[PDB]
Write a protein that binds this ligand. Structure first.
Ligand SMILES: CC[C@@H]1[C@@H]2[C@H](C(=O)N1Cc1ccc3c(c1)OCO3)[C@H](c1ccc(C(=N)N)cc1)N1CCC[C@@H]21
Ligand code: NA
Ligand code: NA
Lengths: 10, 250, 27
């Protein structure tokens, strides 16, 4: 259930 | 956190969430102690019986958070790990003695209303505050019960327990590098850390200078909020010489 | 220098809802 974080952090 | 309550906004601005990249999940709690150093439990990172051995690249630190699952745009900050340092004598074989680790961030995090470092105790504040019956505060996004999950950061205040009572509560060999906290069954009140709260801080507000100090790290327990059991915490002051060494060397 | 003083509480002289419980325990 975690909201997506900006791809920049991945 | 079991039998705690919702945190207020900005109540624990040193709170850190350790977040796994893939699959995306809550790994543990942690603490901000400067603009580039995060403190957590060794077991959050390394635990060979369960084949746990994370590398820097495996996780993220999320700072400034309140909601557990939401991406808190314009409020949280997400940071990459440069390096993990685990206590070289962390005893994962036997009792989790010296359950402590440091993470250095790749870049300094900017402090804000929601992001601010906690103090680390010196001898005198530990001597003054780490007393049976004195209460500290534990915070985290861990489970609400031993056997759901919170929408926002949880908080519970818990009294430090006498070392003999800690010892008599468990068959584990306890060391001077651990303390326990929690109410006794006849005290009526409840509360404990639980799965997901691991690595997060046990803090106390000095009545001498009105500053918050992190006296412990959520380390282990038997179940959560069980009558006759206590949460165990890494004794931060007792390992401070290693913390200083690491930060001074790196 | 500034460690342990929260922007939304100590810096503004606002108390959180249970910090006084801790104070009362410090006997
Ligand atoms: C990875 C450790 C695990 C950790 C913490 C725990 O207690 N362990 C079990 C344990 C305990 C004592 C030990 C040990 C393992 O090996 C030797 O000494 C931790 C944990 C559990 C309960 C509490 C608590 N009730 N306050 C605090 C922390 N759990 C939750 C998920 C990870 C797991
Ligand atoms: Na015992
Ligand atoms: Na208990």
């Amino acid at each position: 259930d975690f909201e997506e974080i900006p791809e920049e952090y991945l | 956190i079991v039998e705690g309550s919702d945190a207020e906004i900005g109540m624990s601005p040193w709170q850190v969430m350790l977040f796994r990249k893939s699959p995306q999940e809550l790994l543990c709690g942690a603490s901000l102690i400067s603009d580039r150093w995060v403190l957590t439990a060794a077991h959050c990172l390394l635990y060979p019986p369960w084949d746990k051995n994370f590398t820097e690249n495996d996780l993220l630190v999320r700072i400034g958070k309140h909601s557990r699952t939401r991406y808190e745009r314009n409020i949280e900050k997400i940071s990459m790990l440069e390096k993990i340092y685990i206590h070289p004598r962390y005893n994962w074989r036997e009792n989790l003695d010296r359950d402590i680790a440091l993470m250095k961030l790749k870049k300094p995090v900017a402090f804000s209303d929601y992001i601010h470092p906690v103090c680390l105790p010196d001898r005198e504040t530990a001597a003054s505050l780490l007393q049976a019956g004195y209460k500290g505060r534990v915070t985290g996004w861990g489970n609400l019960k031993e056997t759901g999950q919170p929408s926002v950061l949880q908080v519970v205040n818990l009294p430090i327990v006498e070392r003999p009572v800690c010892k008599d509560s468990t068959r584990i060999r306890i060391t001077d590098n651990m303390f326990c906290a929690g109410y006794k069954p006849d005290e009526g009140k409840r509360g404990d850390a639980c799965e997901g709260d691991s690595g997060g801080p046990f803090v106390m507000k000095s009545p001498f200078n009105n500053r918050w100090y992190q006296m412990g790290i959520v380390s282990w327990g038997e179940g959560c909020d069980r009558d006759g059991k206590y949460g165990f915490y890494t004794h931060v002051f007792r390992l401070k010489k290693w913390i200083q060494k690491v930060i001074d060397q790196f | 220098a500034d460690c342990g003083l929260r922007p939304l509480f100590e810096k503004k002289s606002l108390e959180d809802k249970t910090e006084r419980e801790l104070l009362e325990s410090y006997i």
